[PDB]
């Protein structure tokens, strides 16, 4: 997206400044930014608010009532493994992770390559049928770019 930072990040002389946006018969994506929750409290993952209970509850509620509307596959990326595990621990502590479980299966991506591969395989096999699944991972991980979520996956 920024074509003015790459020519200065690395010594470069661009002469194009060209971008292209696909067009179809209908809009194939629905990007949206969710700010404050149902309590009108921001769900920002700020460092001073990572341990806040309200934002964790808001994230859990978003993942729960979002998992009841989008079928057969949800991919969620967290900032870091530590934040991901601390958030799922709080979700388990409350009676909120069970409500997410009864909608879609929860799969957690870890650093182990074999465990990640088998989790991806079972996530795919759960997305093939109507059970549904959730893929919890990290944005800066080997699974973020190692796989592509084609239609009906994620």
């Amino acid at each position: 997206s920024p074509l003015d930072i790459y020519p200065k990040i690395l010594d470069f002389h661009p002469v194009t400044m060209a971008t292209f946006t696909m067009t179809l018969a209908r809009v194939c994506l629905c990007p949206m930014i969710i700010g404050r929750g149902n309590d009108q409290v921001a769900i920002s993952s700020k460092f001073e608010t990572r341990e806040d209970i309200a934002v964790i509850r808001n994230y859990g509620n978003l993942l729960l009532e979002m998992s009841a509307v989008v079928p057969d596959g949800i991919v969620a990326f967290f900032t870091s493994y530590q934040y991901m595990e601390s958030t799922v621990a709080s979700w388990y502590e409350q009676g909120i992770l069970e409500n997410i479980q009864r909608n879609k299966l929860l799969f957690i991506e870890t650093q182990d390559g074999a465990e990640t591969s088998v989790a991806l395989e079972k996530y795919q096999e759960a997305c093939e049928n109507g059970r549904g699944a959730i893929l919890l991972s990290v944005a800066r991980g080997k699974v973020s770019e190692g796989i592509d979520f084609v239609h009906h996956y994620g």
Partner: peptide, 11 residues
């Protein structure tokens, strides 16, 4: 509902 529980393989 968008989710179904199958005691065995559905395919």
């Amino acid at each position: 509902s968008l989710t179904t529980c199958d005691p065995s393989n559905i395919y």
